[PDB]
From a paper:
To understand how [name] recognizes [name] before extraction, we solved the crystal structure of the RavZ1–431:LC31–119 complex at 2.5 Å. However, the complex displays only a relatively small binding interface (300 Å2). Nevertheless, the structure of [name] in the complex shows a well-defined resolution of flexible loops, which are missing in the free-structure. Importantly, the N-terminal loop containing the LIR2 motif (residues 25 to 48) is resolved in the structure. LIR2 of [name] interacts with the α2-β3 loop of [name] instead of the canonic LIR-binding site that involves hydrophobic pockets located in β1, β2 and α3. Further analysis of the crystal contacts between symmetry-related [name] molecules (RavZa and RavZb) shows that LIR2 of RavZa interacts extensively with RavZb, involving the α3 loop and the β6-β7 loop. Comparing with the free-[name] structure, the α3 loop in the complex moves ca. 9 Å inward, suggesting a dynamic nature of this region. Key hydrophobic interactions include F29 (RavZa) with Y211 (RavZb), L31 (RavZa) with I170 (RavZb), L208 (RavZb) and F212 (RavZb). It is conceivable that the crystal packing led to a low-energy binding configuration involving interaction of LIR2 with the α3 loop of its symmetric mate.
Numbering used by the authors:
A (entry chain A): 25 to 429
B (entry chain B): 5 to 119
């Protein structure tokens, strides 16, 4: 016999094609993703793993420690190291959604039931709070009275000061392209809704109405007006702003933003920040339980060999599935060479994982394929994992496991 | 309770001394469960007979089969107090290496590598 368990499953499982929008237990490597390709609640949640990585541009561990309890459902609690401020970050949810009507003559639209539920829970927590708190909820807003609407990334923050019993909402909005239309604006001759501000503020007031609370000035803090961005980018800005809100709230300084306090957008969302985001989304394979683990205990999640394997399976799947434009006078490796190398490497890594051993001719074959494994995008994937697995190279990764002769 | 308690050394010695050539090929193996192992089922048949050219790999596979679970949870086979950094070792060389004074090759299994 030959194949027993060369099976790729358990932590080496790559989710199937029909599990693609249905899988909330695991955030798989998406190896062709780019900041420009957009966000959803699962990628955002995945990105949360960066907060306690000390080597991330997004590291929070100087500003906050972890809340000893879990007083707020759906949220990760944090205690400022420089403040009395407690800070709650809601776990991203695809139901955190507000529709609005572009036409001012129609009503303000609606807020998803779960989002309104969260506002009520925030209010009930505040009524019992003895300490100043900040609540950070990522969400999306969409026009419902035009066809071809886009779901627009946006972020909500609420602070509660118990001394003045005041509760202050703010929305941070990274402006995307076509989040506005001159045609519409002209047709409505100016009474035009470009945001969910109306129904959302109404919601927040409806949530606090029975309590002692005063509603602070509601603020929409908008940025990147012309740095003219794809909807895609806006999600990355949202994540960056989650970071800024947390740090600024723990240091008790005003939240500073491109266009207010930051000199350029990419001084805010920095190429380093972008590489961090991209590498997390493209190259890593992370459980929900692992992320909840990280955030609730305040610790890094070390990259695991199985993630390297799963990433390789995704790069492999993508290229085998598709049909590339096959172009001429081509410098560099063919699709076929690369897929052969990937398959070789997956087999070798999985052999190392299960059997803790590698044949010497296996090692010889690997050695023949290493340059192809190191080239281009594949090279960037391999390099991410080599780096995080603490190996100087494929050879120096694999070599302790080879049985010679 | 263990096979060394159930058969005397003399008895064991005559078991090995011949089941050896009524299967001249084969090598005798006692696989038992680590006494402090909380997480793994107890398969019972202790005494096993294995073909020689076989390496530890396949043996691990069949014991992983009678234990009914999925290859995805940790399994380790220790030989005496000692065990493989190499799973490609033929059970013959392992036998000549780690065999007991009574002639049986003893192996114990666990979900962990503990002392």
């Amino acid at each position: 016999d030959i194949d027993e368990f060369d099976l790729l499953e358990g932590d080496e499982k790559l989710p199937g094609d029909s599990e693609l929008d249905k899988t909330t237990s695991i955030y798989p490597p998406e190896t062709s993703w780019e900041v420009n390709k957009g966000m959803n609640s699962s990628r955002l949640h995945k990105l949360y793993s960066l907060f306690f990585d000390k080597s991330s541009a997004f590291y929070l561990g100087d500003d906050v420690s972890v809340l000893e309890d879990k007083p707020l459902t759906g949220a990760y609690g944090f205690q400022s190291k420089k403040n009395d401020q407690q800070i709650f970050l809601f776990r991203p949810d695809s139901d955190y959604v507000a529709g609005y009507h572009v036409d001012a003559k129609s009503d303000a639209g609606w807020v998803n039931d779960k989002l309104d539920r969260r506002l009520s829970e925030i209010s009930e927590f505040c009524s019992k709070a003895t300490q100043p708190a900040t609540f950070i909820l990522p969400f999306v807003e969409m026009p419902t009275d035009i066809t071809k609407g886009v779901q627009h990334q946006v972020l909500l923050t609420i602070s509660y000061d118990p001394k003045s019993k005041q509760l202050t909402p703010t929305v941070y909005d990274s402006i995307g392209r076509d989040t506005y239309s001159e045609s519409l604006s002209s047709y409505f001759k100016g009474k035009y809704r470009t945001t969910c501000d109306e129904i959302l503020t109404q919601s927040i007031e409806k949530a606090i109405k029975s309590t002692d609370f005063t509603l602070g000035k509601f603020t929409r803090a908008a940025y990147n007006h012309q740095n003219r961005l794809t909807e895609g980018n806006c999600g990355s800005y949202t994540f960056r702003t989650i970071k800024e809100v947390i740090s600024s709230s723990a240091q008790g300084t005003e939240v500073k933003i491109p266009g207010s306090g930051y000199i350029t957008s990419n001084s805010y969302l920095t190429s380093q920040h972008v590489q961090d985001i991209e590498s997390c989304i493209k190259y890593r394979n992370l459980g929900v339980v692992d992320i909840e683990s990280a955030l609730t205990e305040g610790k890094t999640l070390p990259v695991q060999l199985s993630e390297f394997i799963v990433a390789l399976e995704d790069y492999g799947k993508l290229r085998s599935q598709q049909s590339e434009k096959s172009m001429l006078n081509f410098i560099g490796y063919s699709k076929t060479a690369k897929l052969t190398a990937v398959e070789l490497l997956i087999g070798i890594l999985n052999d190392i994982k299960g059997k803790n051993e590698i044949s010497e001719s296996q090692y010889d074959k690997l050695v023949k394929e290493v340059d192809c494994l190191m080239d281009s995008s594949l090279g960037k994937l391999v390099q991410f994992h080599l780096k995080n697995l603490g190996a100087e190279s494929l050879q120096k990764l694999v070599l302790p496991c080879v049985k010679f002769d | 309770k263990t096979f060394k308690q159930r058969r005397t050394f003399e008895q064991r010695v005559e078991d090995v001394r011949l089941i050896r050539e009524q299967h001249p090929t084969k090598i005798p193996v006692i696989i038992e469960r680590y006494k402090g192992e909380k997480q793994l089922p107890v398969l019972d048949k202790t005494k096993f007979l294995v073909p020689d050219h076989v390496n530890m790999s396949e043996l691990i596979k069949i014991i992983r089969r009678r234990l009914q679970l999925n290859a995805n949870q940790a399994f380790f086979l220790l030989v005496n107090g000692h065990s493989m950094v190499s799973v490609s070792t033929p059970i013959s060389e392992v036998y000549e290496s780690e065999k007991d004074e009574d002639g049986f090759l003893y192996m114990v299994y666990a979900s962990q590598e503990t002392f």
